[PDB]
Enzyme design. Structure first.
Site, mmCIF file in Angstrom:
data_model
loop_
_atom_site.group_PDB
_atom_site.id
_atom_site.type_symbol
_atom_site.label_atom_id
_atom_site.label_comp_id
_atom_site.label_asym_id
_atom_site.label_seq_id
_atom_site.Cartn_x
_atom_site.Cartn_y
_atom_site.Cartn_z
ATOM 1 N N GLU A 159 16.716 12.629 3.001
ATOM 2 C CA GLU A 159 15.850 13.486 3.799
ATOM 3 C C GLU A 159 16.583 14.706 4.337
ATOM 4 O OE1 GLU A 159 12.727 12.675 6.390
ATOM 5 O OE2 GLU A 159 12.680 10.514 6.000
ATOM 6 N N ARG A 219 12.675 15.388 -4.414
ATOM 7 C CA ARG A 219 13.631 14.295 -4.228
ATOM 8 C C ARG A 219 14.190 13.801 -5.565
ATOM 9 N NH1 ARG A 219 12.885 10.539 1.198
ATOM 10 N NH2 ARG A 219 12.105 12.533 2.010
#
Length: 331
Positions: free
Chosen positions: A120, A294
């Protein structure tokens, strides 16, 4: 032999790393936690030592074990997205403030720290592949409190970097990308490890609740088998030729990209073909409700560890769901 201090050992990473370190006969594992049910197999081991501890309550008792050991792995952190906005201050006090203590314990006694950063940290980065050394870190305004976790973990990376640049702190930061396999963490466990999203999908299958596809389930994620993940983590501990000193290493399988939708259909397919499917409620369906990339760069893992993911999605999907179904309490 090398003394490894695992803070938050009673979980996903602590179990798999302890087994890997104990296979080799030159590691002494000190596992610290408040319980030991998830690592009960290792308590009788002559080279494993359980330590009763809580990084929020204990200060002196944690400082002693940092000085007593050689490498420290602080895995205690609330890493569940709903808690970022629900209890932002508790997420901040534990993930940041408490771990800053342990970080400073490591620079005080000149110990090596292997700290779990997060994926993150990249946030809404525009790069197709997230580079630990080059990619920009993009987050929203402070009025979107979802980002308090990503920004907190980033500041911890920078403070570790400062201690390495200015106080000779030996460190390696690793960023796991959706680790999955046997012995998943609890959904609300304050231990960094298994991909909370994929264990939630399996919980949907086991409990008979629908799979919520937030705005379509189209956001893609790159999952990694714990066999591949714990192998790279073990090599960081090995630190061959000290190639990991001061490094930041993503640990993911970029060839395992799949959206939440494709994950559910994949887990559902393995679900129906499972011998124990009859013990579980009928599938409740996919429900649509109201970060998208991601994908990690693993060149640093290539360079510092000569590591390349080897397991195939189907193997990882089947084994994670299989182990879950046989260890589920039916009574």
């Amino acid at each position: 032999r090398t003394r490894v201090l695992i803070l938050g050992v009673n979980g996903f990473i602590g179990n798999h790393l302890t087994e890997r370190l104990l296979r080799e006969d030159h590691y002494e594992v000190y596992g610290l936690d408040i319980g030991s049910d998830a690592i009960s197999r290792f308590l009788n081991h002559p080279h494993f030592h359980f330590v009763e501890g809580d990084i929020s309550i204990h200060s002196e008792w944690i400082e002693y074990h940092v000085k007593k050991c050689d490498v420290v792995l602080p895995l205690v952190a609330i890493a569940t997205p709903i808690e970022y906005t629900r209890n932002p201050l508790r997420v901040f006090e534990l993930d940041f403030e408490e771990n800053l203590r342990i970080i400073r314990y490591c620079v005080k006694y000149r110990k090596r720290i292997i700290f779990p950063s997060t994926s993150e940290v990249y946030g809404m980065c525009s790069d197709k592949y997230f580079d630990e050394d080059h990619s920009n870190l993009i987050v929203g305004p402070v009025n979107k409190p979802r980002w308090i976790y990503s920004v907190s973990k980033q500041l911890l990376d920078r403070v570790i970097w400062a201690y390495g640049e200015k106080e000779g702190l030996q460190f390696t930061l690793f960023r796991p990308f959706a680790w999955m396999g046997p012995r998943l963490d609890n959904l609300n466990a304050a231990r960094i490890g298994s991909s909370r999203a994929i264990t939630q999908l399996i919980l949907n299958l086991v409990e008979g609740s629908p799979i919520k596809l937030i705005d379509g389930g189209k956001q893609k994620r790159c999952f990694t088998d714990i066999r591949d993940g714990i192998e790279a983590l073990y090599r960081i501990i090995e630190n061959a030729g000290n190639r990991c000193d001061g490094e930041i290493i993503n640990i993911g399988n970029p060839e395992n990209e799949a959206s939440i939708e494709e994950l559910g259909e994949m887990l559902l397919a393995s679900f129906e073909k499972h011998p124990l499917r009859h013990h579980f409620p009928p599938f409740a369906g996919f429900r649509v409700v109201e970060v998208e990339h991601r994908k990690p760069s693993i060149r640093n893992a290539h360079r510092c560890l000569d590591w390349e993911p080897k397991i195939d999605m189907q193997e990882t999907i089947d084994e994670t769901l299989d182990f879950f179904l046989r260890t589920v309490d039916l009574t």
